[PDB]
Amino acid sequence: AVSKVYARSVYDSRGNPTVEVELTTEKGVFRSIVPSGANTGVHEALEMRDGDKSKWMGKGVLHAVKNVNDVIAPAFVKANIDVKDQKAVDDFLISLDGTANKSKLGANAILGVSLAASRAAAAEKNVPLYKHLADLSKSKTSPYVLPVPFLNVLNGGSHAGGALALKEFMIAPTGAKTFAEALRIGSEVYHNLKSLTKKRYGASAGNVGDEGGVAPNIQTAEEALDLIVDAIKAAGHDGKIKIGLDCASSEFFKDGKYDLDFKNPNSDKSKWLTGPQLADLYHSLMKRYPIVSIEDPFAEDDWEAWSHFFKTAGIQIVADRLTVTNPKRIATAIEKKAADALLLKVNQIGTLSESIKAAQDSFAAGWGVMVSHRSGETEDTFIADLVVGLRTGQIKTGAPARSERLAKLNQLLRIEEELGDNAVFAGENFHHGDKLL
Amino acid sequence: AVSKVYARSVYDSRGNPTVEVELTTEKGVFRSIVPSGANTGVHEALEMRDGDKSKWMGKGVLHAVKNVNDVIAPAFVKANIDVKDQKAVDDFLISLDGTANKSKLGANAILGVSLAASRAAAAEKNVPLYKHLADLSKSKTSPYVLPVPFLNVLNGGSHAGGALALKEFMIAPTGAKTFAEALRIGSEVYHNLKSLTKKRYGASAGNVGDEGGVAPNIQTAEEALDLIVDAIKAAGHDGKIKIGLDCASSEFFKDGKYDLDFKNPNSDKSKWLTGPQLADLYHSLMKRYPIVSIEDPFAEDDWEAWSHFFKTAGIQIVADRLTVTNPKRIATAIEKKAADALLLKVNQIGTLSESIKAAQDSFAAGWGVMVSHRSGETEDTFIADLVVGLRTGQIKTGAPARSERLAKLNQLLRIEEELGDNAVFAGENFHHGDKLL
Ligand SMILES: [Mg+2]
Ligand SMILES: [Mg+2]
């Protein structure tokens, strides 16, 4: 059924090259695009870049593209794989690479094929993608569950001015009754926030960062959080809207400690914090603000810190760089009681099947799963169909600005509309969306 | 042939609702989304908004959506229209609305149906959208012409801080050998500019405006243009990259004069410029920098300023708000020798048919045509196929950042690839791309 496998370079939302794959079958042409992160988990599967400093500042994907076209394609076509057998598709791809971290072909060569095969499979089966993905993952479909969108509204951290160390501040309309309502009220808080931001930080403070949130010179998480609370209140949405954070603590972890002044070029080791000290910051924030989720509070291999904090955190704790959507690392994180939610980024692992396994393992342990974009996204809408397919009840796909973000949120509106009464909104139950009766 | 017409609200790139329309035929479901401008020309066809302050801050499009579903749809289906006949599709739509500027139904209701019909028709014909649009406009297809992209890299004007009064500064890789090369070298100039900008103005100055350009607090057009020239040189593309401006001068036209300090609440009235005074500024820029296109140098109805300048410019002058993609205004502009290029915005006039006629009337007069996005865009890629089909040789569709821009740029990559030797890059001949042999 697959007659052609073809890759090209296209541009992600930051204007950097990435791999787009097209699979041709009797049912037509099926396209998937590979996303890209920044300051990525050190344990993520290989994102292969050309490193030709003379083109694209070394970020070309000509090499990965060649791997699709000259290596994967002729082997994939001749193998007569049934695309409906996602496991077979991905087992073949993994077998062809032959390395733990897809370092022979690149995860960005393999993933596009994995994802395109699933769209081709849905076409063959004459079902929408989300229905096929539920089939693949054996998720229940009566009712489907539409996710709470965790909307980035403000960014701090390594790519913003000011001293604010924490990376993502998100609003989650857990109190909304429908996904349509969630997106609307979230857009309204967003606009209220841009307005307040411009009034307080200047006209330019309205400009947006990579994920679409405002990113002005902010000094402390409390400053950011007071600001967001002000916007929520102004928009009249207190008590339908809660807050999520992504600390991205791996970006300020050095030598075993946490440097919150990691931007400040002369940081004093005397106030680099231990895990417990940093845990005390998060505790203070929790007491003061309506935070319902915290992601990467500690660094990607700092197990003792995660495990100590998790006992008493009492809210959703999400693993991103800790777990890297990798069933092996997820197993450890479960055993160590380090977290209770997986941030699922398909390109961290490089195949759909491994990503589905990642999610099944997390649900089995009573963990939640937040499906997630990358900071470098594209017009590809796969993750919208995925979060519904896996019935997780929560997605993180950016601010309600920039269309590499709206593209997913818009796909969710279409999915919501298509399903009518055969879908529920996750709402207060986002953590265990998969277990909703 | 058409069995259903259906509209829904989706979100544009700024997180404001807009209208998406799906047409269903024997060949599938065909989707179009309507973009949205800021500070729209007074002569533009009506964009109907709901004005319910308790929802999306009055920016809802539920009335327009209702217009499609309750009014257009039943009548359109019962009319048994041949979607291949775009003129028929559009004559039906405009004669249903019955008002000159589409104020009964809304241009944001009509346009979605118009565009979706063209996609439906390409499918019936078993041809790519660009080929069908060529057929519709009687454009030659041997070879097709790929456009030079005018890429936003920097903005000033009403929504930027600092004093800079002109709106858009674009780079145009006219010296590139292919579209693909154009997009690479353009991406490189953009990133070099982003880095130089963060270095000079601070990390926050790297955040992006609506169209994906940087928007630092810049004080003069010279400062902006010197930065761009620095970035071109740094990226190693001297000579191969030219500059375009959109002055958006209508936003600073007051009391018959032009206020270049319009962002100052106490701007000095005695320093406001007459048309000829302003023209002398543009002359200075034109001679000092590799500027090959200036858009909206004078206000939307300041006809005499345009006609007096145009004689003197010696470079492409583009009408955007003057002409509003309207054949009646375009005729006047041609008669008054006010410009020599149309900025073609399908949603300024509201149907594809009127838009083609606008372009045709332009080429007929020896004008160029620059196909254009709106500042509020979506994941919709129609205008990529339009610019290729109309054979214009130039498109303005954003910075190489934010996927409502890359979506179009990526679609052009695909088209270029698919056409191979049956396409040529407009390059230095962008102005008269339609007349390439
Ligand atoms: Mg993270
Ligand atoms: Mg303009």
Torsion of Cα atoms, B186 then B188 then B190 then B193, to 10°? -140
DSSP secondary structure code for residue A336 in this structure:
T
Which residue has tokens 């118009």? B114
Q: Where are the beta strands (DSSP E) in A368-432?
A: 368-372, 394-396, 423-425
Neighbouring-strand partners of residue A21: A7, A32
Ligand 1 centre from A373 Cα, in Å? Answer: 10
Cβ-nearest to B406 among A8, A13, A57: A13
**Which residue positions of B form the known binding site for Mg(2+)?**
246, 295, 320
**Residue closest to A42 by CA, chosen among A375, A321, A377:** A321
Any idea which ligand is nearest the CA of A295? 1
- Is B53 catalytic? The answer is no
Resolution (A): 1.7
**Contact of B371 with B386, CB cutoff 8 Å:** yes
**Which residue positions of A form the known binding site for Mg(2+)?**
246, 295, 320
Q: How far apart (Å, rounded) are the C-alpha atoms in residues A20 and A111? A: 10
How close B195 comes to chain A (CA, Å)? Answer: 12
- Residue of B18, B171, B402, B409 best to disrupt the A interface, most CBs of A under 10 A: B402
Superfamily of domain A1-126: Enolase-like, N-terminal domain (3.30.390.10)
**Residue closest to B367 by CA, chosen among B409, B322, B425, B399:** B322
Which residues, 6+ apart, have CB-to-CB distance to A290 below 8 Å? A229, A241, A242, A243
Name the structure determination technique: X-ray
Half-sphere exposure of B268 toward its Cβ, with a 13 Å CA cutoff?
2
Which residues, 6+ apart, have CB-to-CB distance to B100 below 8 Å? none
CA B99 vs CA A10, A278, B106, B132: distances in Å: 43, 64, 10, 29
Chain A residues with CB under 8 Å of B417 CB are 8
**Which residue positions of B form the known binding site for substrate?**
159, 168, 295, 320, 372-375, 396
Secondary element (H or E) of residue B117: helix B107-124
**Contact of A226 with A168, CB cutoff 8 Å:** no
- Is B345 catalytic? The answer is yes
Pairing of strands A168-172, A151-155: antiparallel
Q: How far apart (Å, rounded) are the C-alpha atoms in residues A400 and B22? A: 23
CA A321 vs CA A63, A194, A344, B104, B178: distances in Å: 26, 29, 10, 54, 40
Catalytic residue among A44, A47, A188, A211: A211
Q: How far apart (Å, rounded) are the C-alpha atoms in residues B398 and B395? A: 9
Q: How far apart (Å, rounded) are the C-alpha atoms in residues A397 and A387? A: 11
Q: How far apart (Å, rounded) are the C-alpha atoms in residues B313 and A389? A: 58
Degrees (nearest 5) of the Cα angle A259, A261, A267?
A: 80
How close A409 comes to chain B (CA, Å)? Answer: 8
Catalytic residue among A345, A354, A408, A416: A345
Q: How far apart (Å, rounded) are the C-alpha atoms in residues B90 and B68? A: 14
Percent of residues in chain B assigned helix, strand, coil, to nearest 5: 45, 20, 40
DSSP secondary structure code for residue B46 in this structure:
P
Q: How far apart (Å, rounded) are the C-alpha atoms in residues A159 and A365? A: 35
One-letter-per-residue 3-state SS of B275-334: HHHHHHHHHHHHHHCCEEEEECCCCCCCHHHHHHHHHHHCCEEEECCCCCCCHHHHHHHH
Q: How far apart (Å, rounded) are the C-alpha atoms in residues B378 and B32? A: 10
Which residues, 6+ apart, have CB-to-CB distance to A180 below 8 Å? A413, A416
Domain ranges, ordered by start, for chain A: 1-126, 127-437
Degrees (nearest 5) of the Cα angle B326, B153, B302?
A: 35
Partner-chain contact A187 B11, CB within 8 Å: yes
Q: How far apart (Å, rounded) are the C-alpha atoms in residues B298 and B184? A: 33
Ligand 2 centre from B90 Cα, in Å? Answer: 25
Q: Would you state the structure tokens that stand for residue B329, as one six-digit string?
A: 């205004």
Q: How far apart (Å, rounded) are the C-alpha atoms in residues B378 and B185? A: 24
Cβ-nearest to A402 among B191, B216, B403: B403
Q: Would you state the structure tokens that stand for residue A228, as one six-digit string?
A: 């967001």
Ligand 2 centre from B245 Cα, in Å? Answer: 9
CA A25 vs CA A72, A73, A113, B124, B200: distances in Å: 16, 13, 13, 20, 51
Q: How far apart (Å, rounded) are the C-alpha atoms in residues A39 and A401? A: 22
Phi/psi-derived region of residue A253, left when phi > 0, alpha when psi is between -120 and 50, beta in every other case: beta
Expressed in angstroms, the distance from the first to the final Cα of chain B is 38
Q: How many CB atoms lie within 10 A of CB A419?
A: 18
Q: How many CB atoms lie within 10 A of CB A27?
A: 17
Cβ-nearest to B15 among A160, A400, A407: A400
**Contact of B177 with B237, CB cutoff 8 Å:** no
Ligand 1 (ion): residues with CB under 5 Å are: A 246, 320
Cβ-nearest to B8 among A187, A203, A413: A413
DSSP secondary structure code for residue B345 in this structure:
-
Q: Which residue in chain B is spatially nearest to A236 when comparing CA positions? A: B54
Q: How far apart (Å, rounded) are the C-alpha atoms in residues A93 and A113? A: 8
CATH topology match: B1-126 vs B127-437: no
Exposed, middle or buried: residue A335 (CB in 10 Å: 0-12, 13-18, 19+)?
A: exposed
Q: How far is Cα of residue A283 from the mean position of the Cα atoms in its chain?
A: 25
Q: Where are the beta strands (DSSP E) in A93-150?
A: 144-146, 148-149
Q: How far apart (Å, rounded) are the C-alpha atoms in residues A263 and A268? A: 12
**Residue closest to A377 by CA, chosen among B404, B33, B150, B194:** B404
Q: Specify the 3-state DSSP secondary structure of A252.
A: coil
Chain A residues with CB under 8 Å of B183 CB are 11
Q: How many CB atoms lie within 10 A of CB B63?
A: 16
Torsion of Cα atoms, A13 then A192 then A387 then A424, to 10°? -160
Catalytic residue among B20, B22, B211, B404: B211
Neighbouring-strand partners of residue A36: A376
**Span B127-437 CATH architecture:** Alpha-Beta Barrel (3.20)
Degrees (nearest 5) of the Cα angle A19, A24, A26?
A: 160
CA B267 vs CA A59, B259, B271, B281: distances in Å: 46, 8, 8, 18
Q: How far apart (Å, rounded) are the C-alpha atoms in residues B241 and B236? A: 10
Any idea which ligand is nearest the CA of B396? 2
CA B221 vs CA A356, B39, B228: distances in Å: 53, 21, 11
CA A299 vs CA A322, A356, B401: distances in Å: 7, 24, 30
